[PDB]
Amino acid sequence: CVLIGQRCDNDRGPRCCSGQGNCVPLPFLGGVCAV
């Protein structure tokens, strides 16, 4: 799992650590873990 400010992707991975943040999807960066 990845941490806040690190990029993630909800479907493909990676995904945020359960106590980190929600993986908010981003246009081209896939997503990012944010609170």
CB of 29 closer than 8 Å to CB of 14: no
Rounded Cα–Cα distance for residues 12 and 28 (Å): 14
Rounded Cα–Cα distance for residues 25 and 18 (Å): 16
CB-based contacts of 13, cutoff 8 Å, min separation 6 = none
Rounded Cα–Cα distance for residues 2 and 7 (Å): 7
Q: Which two tokens stand for residue 12?
A: 């493909």
CB of 23 closer than 8 Å to CB of 35: no
